[PDB]
Each structure stands twice: as structure tokens, then as C-alpha cells.
Design a protein around this nucleic acid. Structure first.
Lengths: 210, 60, 126, 100, 78, 116, 97, 156
RNA sequence: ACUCGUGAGAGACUGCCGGGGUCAACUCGGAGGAAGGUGGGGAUGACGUCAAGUCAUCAUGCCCCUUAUGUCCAGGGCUUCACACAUGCUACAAUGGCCGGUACAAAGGGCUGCGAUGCCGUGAGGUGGAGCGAAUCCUUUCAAAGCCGGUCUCAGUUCGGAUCGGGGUCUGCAACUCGACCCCGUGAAGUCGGAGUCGCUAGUAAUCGCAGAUCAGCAACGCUGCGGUGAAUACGUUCCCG
């Protein structure tokens, strides 16, 4: 319908960096398999925690798993108790040893993935969806410094039978411009009536910064 | 992509012709690649999310 | 001396300056035995016929790539820009006749969902 | 008059075969120009506390070139009736329009 | 033709059958070989999946693999 | 000329004139005409009866021809149609034997078309 | 001689990494060949971009492999130590031949 | 490039052996696809066979046949109101050379000589005298044009 | 030194001159220039449509099975065939076939992989392992159409290869149902195709080989790409289609 390519996959050569970074000849399928099982292992407890980014640098078979989140304090509970448990399970599930770096984003309302987190987690919690969309926005535009704001919510909105898509915005979100620095995040709400897939586009600025 | 078949394609088969690829992320039997070990859908979604190192969208 | 590089479709040719009574050295061969088609024989000597130094100029060339005709048109180009590199007042007389200008026409990219580049699969709607 | 009858996602009852044969057979009556007919029977709307939307597509190579023709209706017989009314008028027009 | 396929289960069974000079109807799974002419005379209940068809083996069967003296498909047309 | 049983034409070369027999194609003509010594470029009008003698004795001696291949091919097809093979079933029903496509093509075995 | 052939995905990181190797061996002092571009390899993978029936309308994903070369002549172990001592970008794999 | 106006056309180099626009254009219309070199061997061999059967300059024989097949009026196509009207229209120079060479090649290709060289030689010769079928197609095209002169007024 | 390989940079902006422009945009010509006016091609699909597609990639609400609608294996089927459609490939020959000699590519692929000289075969291939994780070694120094020469004389043929018989090789536990390839024979339809209809505006159409992914093997004539040789025509919006 809207045949819109994932813009983090449309600027992954130009502005947005890769999330996983190594070099691999004849070891690549194994590094893919470990990358997948690591991201499944970091889905659940960190999606409780407020995860945004999961980068995996990979040096000579050590591993370096780095996570950008919005609360160091739920990811790091008691020191080593909440960190070294998921870290140690990453050390056992992989056949390797894990150096887990955990870091905070300076503004959670600035990331499109975390905006999709807070919106969809509100939308599972029986709030008004137009009220939710408005809440995430306006406040986000000011927060740090955003130029774009696109929030599309499809699915059983309000528990209705029809799957109505909604489309709210503010400012400038140019997708066809490649010097855009757009963050994109889709996260899917889980109501009892079903799943409300939320897409958030956030246009930070014109800046190439090449 | 049933767990009996996802699990059965990872054991040691009783003949060498019987071992097939079966994409790791979902378990999709047809259209699996060898260098990635991912089917075309998991290649397209993971390569869109920048999760695969340096495969990117093509234009020559 | 004065060399040069002539680039046609995927061919490329390298020539050099030289003054002598008529000789043409391709990759170990003569011009009449490397180009048996007699039309490319005009297509390469036409810059020599324009600024009329057909016999008063002999030089050897080395090439690469293309097919027959890409190397022919490339060697036209390299003779022409070499004749810039002999006398610059030969240069407005070359460019006027249609010369010194390599043809940027290359075999374009095949497109997905087509038999060739610009050829749809022939569709009979019912 | 070669008559291919495909589903789309649907059973094809002996009532549907016979009815298809007789509506489309109207066209064999008066348009001698016919060749192949291709007839394909979609079934959505179903499953949604609502009434199923049928769709019929019909392809027809005349003697000469290719008609197509598409109809959506709450039931199947009413839809195929309607489709044959349309086709009959068209063809006589492609019969029509000419004759000096 | 390095070595033709032999059906080792049927091979063990066949040898036992011909050493005792006993002939018995055999319910055989094997559709793959009529390897030696040691199989001549033995009745093979060939299994096309669904039932067993008795097949007498004579001298002309050598070189035809065992399964398709019994066909797997049924076709009439009307 | 006359040979093993195939009437040779007026003006054909020898490597084509030998081909008109049931047992000989082009390669057998290139090997027979190399073994015996007749020039392949010789026409049939210019053919010698002693060349018919040596050529004829060679290709009835060391190779098989019309009656041997027609009775041999016929006897082998009826061999596999007597014993009850699946290829015997294909030769019975008039279907392609190699297990190839039967749904649309293989019209050269079913033959002329009847349409229902 | 110790010939280092380094491969990567980023031309920028392999150019700054080659600047680290040239600044390293040149800093310790030796005869060193500068960065030589071996050309590439591209893996082009055509993906039917649909969960279901749309064989046309693809998207094809390439894969760039950049190959840089630095040939080292006259090795001294004070220079050889700094090879295994630091590698900064670590998206580059270094073949020591 | 129609509906935007006239489109610029490629300039055509002349012949190496004979030195004419019309010889090279005959070559590019001889070109059953792929083999321009073989098209040059057909055209050249056919024009030296025309040189054998004339003993003169072959391009003069070619331009005299080209003149004797070249039409002046062409019929077409406009159907005003439920009747198809053959409308006669003045033929441009390039259109007339195109119909001359294209008819020459195609009706040489229908002719029953052994090779293509003998076909094209005999068709250029018979069109030079005026005895080919292509000259009869010129006379049938002027037959349709002069038979349909009245409909030509539309000024179209 | 020339290429070439890959890094950085210059270069096309109606910038410069002539005319129309309301002295506005913009358009017609000229110069310089490798290129002239979005130079060529990509990647890039707005708000929405069609209850279009997919609960079989995945995820999933609800309903159903839980002694089976789970699961394990052998054999069979997904390849059946009086038919009808659809996309392709090889053709119907002399611009051609067959034999001999000879010249020019681009891109790619390679670890329990790619595998050379040599030897055994007619040939698939066998024996053997040089050498390479590869601008190096191997895919032969890479092609085929091309050119030079000979033969064939318009014919159901030296066209055409379907089919069928015999004889093999390789892959695999296993080529019967159901693999490809080679050798010998066999040698059918087919004489440019009714109504109609499809593609394409320049390195395009047309034709010629080459590589790749999937893959032990292959139904590859497919798909994705690479290059070779290379045309005709466009008067123009009346008509058909959007």
C-alpha cells in the first residue's frame, strides 16, 4: 500500500551506521547465528528494562555486546546480580566470553525506538490512543531537538473490529531526502483484542556531518 | 517451520543427502542462502535493520 | 613521446606519437589483418583523413577489452586525441566534423522483472 | 467453445458447473466469434461476522482479441448472471460498429 | 558399473530362501534392485505403499529394478 | 547404386549415401569410409562395384543393418512389453517411456489430437 | 618480508587503519610500501521482497569487500611488536603473509 | 519522442567501397539482425554481380533502380465516420527512399535465386530495367493513390 | 613512462554570446568543452485505493485436536493424462548446414573447495596431484557469433532434432516409479504459421556466448547479472488505450 522502505535500511550506507560490526570469511554464518540468539536473549528482560539499541562489536572471538537503553538501574540492578546474570547467560549460550557494555541515552524521548516503546506500552495499558499519540509527540518535538514526527497506529484501535490506521505528525519529516538523520522505530502493542503496531519517525536534522 | 522439523534438520542425519539448510532465524525450508544461513525474508528484514555486517541495498 | 588512451564501450586502446612513412602496429599484427571488415578500416583512419596526414604518421598501439568494433571506435578516439597532441590548430577541425567526442553509449543495466533491459515479458490479459 | 473453470479459493459445486455452462452458453448462442473462456471464482468477505463477497472474473478470447470482465456480488449466481448481461451487450457492440 | 546395488536385507533373506530350497511369498519393501540372477523363481510381494503385489521372477527380469513390476499409479480417464 | 538393401540415390556423397541405411548415420559413415578407404567425396554415379564389394562385406561383417536392427529393436520392445515392466505399461498405453511430462506435452506419442 | 593484506567493509576505517599501520611502521622506521588498493569483491543477492506471490518487484542487496595492501620489507621485532599490540577499528581483518 | 515534436536523427556515414549514403542505407536495411558484416558481404557481392551484368558503375545502376521503385504518393488510413478512407498523401524524400530500399530488399527476399547475393543482384537489375515485382508494387501503390484521389482533400 | 587497480579532487551551473520574451520566469541557435541544458542508468514509491496478497517466513487474537489434526520410519505421491490455456526454448534452412585454420571480451566463482602438466579412453570421464583461502593458483593463456578456406545445390534434404533401441560415465546408502551427461544407431512433426496479439525509440531492438546464486547430483531452455556484434523508424495527434 504505502511501499515505504525502512529508512534505517535506506540510509544504512550513508548516515546511519550498522548495528553489528566485524569481518568474517567462512565464519559468517556462525556469527549470524550467534547474533540472532543474542538478540532473542536480549529481547525479554531488556524489553522490560527499556532497551533501544543492541550493538555487537566482535573482535578476535571475544565478543563485545553493547546496549543503549533509557535506565541504567533496571538493566544494572544490584551490580553483577542483574548485569552478570544476563551477561553470564550470554557467556554460556554463545561459546564465547562476553564484555557487556551498558549505556544511557541522554534523552529517551529523542529515540524513535523508545518512543515506540512508551507509546505501545501505553496502548496495551487501555489508555486512549489519540491521547497517547499526542502525549508522545509535542513533548518529543521540544525535548532535545527534532524536526520530524510521524506516528502511525494500525490494528484494532480501541478494541474495534475495523483495523483503522492513524496518522499524526508535526513539522518536517522528509523520507526521500537521504541527508535526513531520521530515526525510525516500530514496536507492537499487545492488547487482549490483538496487536497495535506503532511506527514512529523522528527527524532530528539536516546535518550530514560527513 | 514446525519445531519437530526445525529441530530435526539440526540433528545428524542417517545419510549425508538428508542434511539440508533450513534458515536459522525462522525455520523456512525453501529459499535459504548459504553465506548468511538466512532465508530471503530474514535476510531482507535483518539487512534492513543493519544487523548483518555490510550487506546493504544495491544500485549500480 | 605523445601517447594516449581511447575509451569505447568496454574496450580501451593505448597509442603513441611517431613520425614515419606508413605503418600500423596493433598487438603484433597489421591493420589489414587485425580488422578484416574494411569498414572499421575507415572508422579508424577517418581522423587521419580529416587532418590529412594519413601517410605522414606511423605509430604502434596496444589495446584491451571490448570486441572488434569497440576496439575500432576506441582507436578512432585515440588517433583523434593524439592529433590534438600533435598540433592544437588541428583541434578545431577535428571537433567540427564529429570527432574528439567519445560516445558514452554503453550497454545499460538489465532490470528485474524484464527479459532484457527495456523488454517486458509479453503479457496477455484475458 | 472451450470452457475452463477454475476456483479461486472455493469449492466448485455441480450447480456452479451447470449454471456456468448455461449463462456463458448464452454467449455461444449469438456470438459465433468465440474461442476460449476462462472463469475464476474468488471468495472473500467471508470470516468477519459479515457476508461473503464473491468475485467472478471471466476471460474470453473471441475470434480475435481478448476481452476481460470482472464482477463482485453477495452471491455467485446473481454475479454470473450480471456478468453475462454485460458481455452480451459488449460483444454485439464489437459486433456493432462498422458497417460502412 | 563399479558395483550394482544389492538390497542387503533382501540379500540376506534371499540366500536363506534358496539354501533351504524353500519358496515363500515375500512381503518386500524393496523397490530398488533385482541384483543377482540368484533371485530367479522367488515370488516377491512388491510394496507400492498400499498393498503387496506378487511378482514371479524369471530369467528376463535381470536388469530391471524390482519395484516396477508393480505400478504405483492408477489411471482410466472416464 | 545398390548395397546392403538400400537403393542409393543418383548424386549423393558417400558419407551421406551410407547414411540412408537403417544402421548407419554420419559417424558410422566417417568411420566406415576411413576403415575401408573409399573417398567420402565420391558421388554415387562414380561408385565402383568392387567398392560395393569391399564396403558391403565390411558393413555386413562388422556391423548390423536393416533386418537385424528392425527385428532386434522390435524384439526388445516386445521383450519389455511381455514381461510386465512399467516401461512395458508405457508402451502398452501409448505414453512416453522415459517418465517425462505427460500433462501438457508428449504429443508425439499420443499422436494426432482428439479434443473433448 | 612481512606482507600485510587487510580487508574490511568501510573504506574510511580501512584508510585510517592503513594510516595507523603506515604511521606505526614509519614511526618505528623501516622500508614500507604505501597503501595499495586491491579492488573489491561484491556479493549481489537478489531477494524476492514478498512473503507471498510476487516474483517480479525484487530488491537486491550487495556486499562490498574492500581490500587494502601494505607490504613490509626488512622486519625488526620492535616494529613487529606494534603489529600485534594495537588494532583500533576491529572491523578490519588483517592477513599476515 | 513523438508527441513532443520532431526528434533528432542519427547521422549516417557513407560507404567505404562505393562512397554513397544510399549504399550504406541499403546495407542497414539488408541487415537481418546481428550480422552487419555479413550484410556488407551481401550488398557488396550483389553490387559486383551488378557490375558484372552491367559493366558500369554499380551505384548508378543502384540509384536508377532506386529511382524506378521510388514512390511519390502513399495511401492511408483516416476513417471519417464509419467508413475507412484510403487517403493519398505526398511522400517526403526520406520516406520515399525508405520505401524504395525496403521494398527492394523485401521483394528481393521473396525472389527465388539460390543465395541472397544472386537475389539482390537480380532485383537491382530487374528494378533498373523496370521488371521486378517491386516496380509492380510501386505501380500498385500509385494505383491505390490515383484510384483514391478524391478523399485526399481533408488536407491531412 | 603508458594503462589499470582504489583514494582524494576539478568539471555542467542556462555559466559565457545572439534572438524571442511584460526586460519575468523560460524557450530557438552559437562557442568553449570529454560531456549541454533533469549527459546515461540506477537506488529512492507521497496521502490513500483494491476488505488485493500472505495466520505456510515470522509474530499473533479467538476457535478447534491432545490418544491425536502431535511425533518417528519404510515405501509411494507432489513428475499421473482424452484434454484446454500460459510463459519460454529449438526449429522450418544457403545471411544456412558440416570439416579445417585463425582473432578479439567483460564480469564473476573456489576448503574437506577450484583442481593444472602428464598418462588411459572416441567421449562423457578415470588415474594423479602442481598450485592456490587466491589482481598471483585454478576456472585453460579464457569465450561464441567474426574472419579465411573447402564441401553441400534448394531437396522433407548433409534442414530439423523429437521419439525409440543398444552401449556407457559420474553423483549419491540408493538413479524402477523419477537424475544429468557421453557414444552408436533411429530420424517424427515442421515449407514462417487463421481471428487476433505482444515487445521495443539507442549501444535500444535483434542475435552471440560467459558467470553466478540455490546445489552431492540435476529437470536451468528458468532466474539474476556480464560483456560481443549491432539496426530500422518517429510525417504527426484525426483514431484505439491509460
Amino acid at each position: 500500500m504505502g511501499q515505504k522502505i525502512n529508512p534505517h535500511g535506506f540510509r544504512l550506507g550513508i548516515t546511519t551506521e550498522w548495528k553489528s560490526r566485524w569481518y568474517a570469511d567462512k565464519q559468517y554464518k556462525d556469527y549470524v547465528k550467534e547474533d540472532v540468539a543474542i538478540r532473542k536473549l536480549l529481547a525479554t528482560g531488556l524489553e522490560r528494562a527499556g532497551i533501544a539499541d543492541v550493538e555487537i562489536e566482535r573482535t578476535r572471538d571475544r565478543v563485545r555486546v553493547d546496549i543503549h537503553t533509557a535506565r541504567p538501574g533496571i538493566v544494572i540492578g544490584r551490580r553483577g546480580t542483574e548485569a552478570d546474570r544476563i551477561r553470564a547467560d550470554l557467556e554460556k549460550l554463545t561459546g564465547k566470553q562476553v564484555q557487556l557494555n551498558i549505556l544511557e541515552v541522554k534523552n529517551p524521548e529523542s529515540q524513535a525506538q523508545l518512543v515506540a516503546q512508551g507509546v505501545a506500552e501505553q496502548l496495551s495499558n487501555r489508555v486512549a490512543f489519540r491521547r497517547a499519540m499526542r502525549k508522545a509527540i509535542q513533548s518529543a518535538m521540544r525535548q532535545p531537538n527534532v524536526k520530524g514526527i510521524r506516528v502511525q497506529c494500525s490494528g484494532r484501535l480501541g478494541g474495534a473490529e475495523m483495523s483503522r490506521s492513524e496518522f499524526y505528525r508535526e513539522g518536517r519529516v522528509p523520507l526521500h531526502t537521504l541527508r535526513a538523520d531520521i530515526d525510525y522505530g516500530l514496536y507492537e502493542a499487545k492488547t487482549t483484542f490483538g496487536r497495535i503496531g506503532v511506527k514512529v519517525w523522528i527527524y532530528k536534522g539536516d546535518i550530514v556531518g560527513g | 517451520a514446525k519445531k519437530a522439523l526445525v529441530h530435526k534438520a539440526n540433528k545428524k542425519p542417517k545419510f549425508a543427502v538428508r542434511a539440508y539448510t533450513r534458515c536459522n532465524k525462522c525455520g523456512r525450508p525453501h529459499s535459504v542462502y548459504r553465506k548468511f544461513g538466512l532465508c530471503r525474508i530474514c535476510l531482507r528484514e535483518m539487512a534492513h535493520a543493519g544487523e548483518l555486517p555490510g550487506v546493504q541495498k544495491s544500485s549500480w | 613521446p605523445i601517447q594516449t588512451v581511447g575509451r569505447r564501450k568496454e574496450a580501451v586502446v593505448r597509442v603513441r606519437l611517431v613520425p614515419g612513412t606508413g605503418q600500423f602496429n596493433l598487438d603484433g599484427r597489421t591493420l589489414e589483418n587485425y580488422f578484416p571488415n574494411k569498414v572499421h578500416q575507415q572508422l579508424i583512419k577517418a581522423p587521419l583523413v580529416t587532418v590529412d596526414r594519413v601517410d605522414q604518421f606511423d605509430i604502434y598501439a596496444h589495446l584491451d577489452g571490448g570486441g572488434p568494433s569497440g576496439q575500432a571506435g576506441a582507436l578512432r578516439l585515440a588517433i583523434a586525441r593524439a592529433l590534438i597532441l600533435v598540433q592544437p590548430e588541428d583541434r578545431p577541425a577535428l571537433k567540427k566534423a564529429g570527432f574528439l567526442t567519445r560516445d558514452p553509449r554503453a550497454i545499460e543495466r538489465k532490470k528485474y522483472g524484464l527479459k532484457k533491459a527495456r523488454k517486458a515479458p509479453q503479457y496477455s490479459k484475458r | 467453445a472451450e470452457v475452463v473453470v477454475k476456483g479461486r479459493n472455493v469449492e466448485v459445486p455441480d450447480h456452479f458447473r451447470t449454471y456456468v455452462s448455461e449463462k456463458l452458453s448464452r454467449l455461444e448462442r449469438f456470438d459465433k466469434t468465440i474461442y476460449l473462456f476462462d472463469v475464476e471464482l474468488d471468495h472473500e468477505r467471508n470470516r468477519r461476522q459479515r457476508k461473503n463477497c464473491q468475485h467472478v472474473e471471466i476471460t474470453a478470447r473471441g475470434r480475435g482479441p481478448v476481452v476481460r470482465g470482472e464482477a463482485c456480488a453477495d452471491s455467485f449466481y446473481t454475479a454470473f448472471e450480471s456478468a453475462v448481461q454485460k458481455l452480451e451487450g459488449r460483444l454485439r457492440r464489437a459486433k456493432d460498429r462498422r458497417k460502412i | 558399473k563399479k558395483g550394482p546395488f544389492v538390497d542387503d536385507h533382501l540379500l540376506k533373506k534371499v540366500d536363506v530362501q534358496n539354501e533351504k530350497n524353500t519358496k515363500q511369498v515375500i512381503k518386500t519393501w524393496s523397490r530398488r534392485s533385482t541384483i543377482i540372477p540368484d533371485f530367479i523363481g522367488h515370488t516377491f510381494a512388491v510394496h507400492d505403499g498400499r498393498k503387496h503385489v506378487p511378482v514371479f521372477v524369471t530369467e528376463a527380469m535381470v536388469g530391471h529394478k524390482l519395484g516396477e513390476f508393480a505400478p504405483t499409479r492408477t489411471f482410466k480417464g472416464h | 547404386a545398390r548395397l546392403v538393401g538400400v537403393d542409393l540415390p543418383r548424386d549423393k556423397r558417400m558419407e551421406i549415401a551410407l547414411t540412408y541405411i537403417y544402421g548407419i548415420g554420419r559417424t558410422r559413415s566417417n568411420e566406415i569410409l576411413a576403415a575401408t578407404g573409399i573417398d567420402k567425396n565420391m558421388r554415387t554415379k562414380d561408385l565402383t562395384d568392387d567398392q560395393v564389394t569391399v564396403l558391403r562385406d565390411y558393413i555386413e561383417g562388422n556391423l548390423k543393418v536393416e533386418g537385424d536392427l528392425r527385428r532386434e529393436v522390435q524384439a526388445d520392445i516386445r521383450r519389455k512389453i511381455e514381461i510386465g515392466c512399467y516401461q512395458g505399461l508405457r508402451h502398452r498405453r501409448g505414453l512416453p517411456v522415459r517418465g517425462q511430462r505427460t500433462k501438457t506435452n508428449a504429443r508425439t506419442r499420443k499422436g494426432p489430437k482428439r479434443t473433448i | 618480508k612481512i606482507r600485510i593484506r587487510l580487508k574490511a567493509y568501510d573504506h574510511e576505517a580501512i584508510d585510517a587503519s592503513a594510516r595507523k599501520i603506515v604511521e606505526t611502521v614509519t614511526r618505528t622506521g623501516a622500508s614500507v610500501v604505501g597503501p595499495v588498493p586491491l579492488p573489491t569483491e561484491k556479493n549481489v543477492y537478489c531477494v524476492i521482497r514478498s512473503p507471498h506471490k510476487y516474483k517480479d518487484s525484487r530488491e537486491h542487496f550487495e556486499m562490498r569487500t574492500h581490500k587494502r595492501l601494505i607490504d613490509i620489507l626488512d622486519p625488526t621485532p620492535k616494529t613487529v611488536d606494534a603489529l600485534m599490540r594495537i588494532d583500533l577499528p576491529a572491523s578490519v581483518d588483517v592477513n599476515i603473509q | 519522442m513523438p508527441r513532443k515534436g520532431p526528434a533528432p536523427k542519427r547521422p549516417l556515414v557513407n560507404d567505404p567501397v562505393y562512397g554513397s549514403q544510399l549504399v550504406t542505407q541499403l546495407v542497414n536495411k539488408v541487415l537481418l539482425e546481428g550480422k552487419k558484416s555479413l550484410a556488407e558481404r551481401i550488398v557488396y557481392g550483389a553490387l559486383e554481380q551488378a557490375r558484372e551484368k552491367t559493366g558500369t558503375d554499380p551505384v548508378v545502376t543502384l540509384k536508377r533502380a532506386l529511382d524506378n521503385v521510388k514512390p511519390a504518393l502513399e495511401v492511408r488510413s483516416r476513417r471519417v465516420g464509419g467508413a475507412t478512407y484510403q487517403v493519398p498523401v505526398e511522400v517526403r524524400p526520406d520516406r520515399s527512399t525508405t520505401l524504395a530500399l525496403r521494398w527492394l530488399v523485401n521483394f528481393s527476399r521473396q525472389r527465388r535465386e539460390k543465395t541472397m547475393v544472386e537475389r539482390l543482384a537480380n532485383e537491382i537489375l530487374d528494378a533498373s530495367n523496370g521488371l521486378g515485382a517491386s516496380v509492380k508494387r510501386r505501380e500498385d501503390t500509385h494505383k491505390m493513390a490515383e484510384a483514391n484521389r478524391a478523399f485526399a482533400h481533408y488536407r491531412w
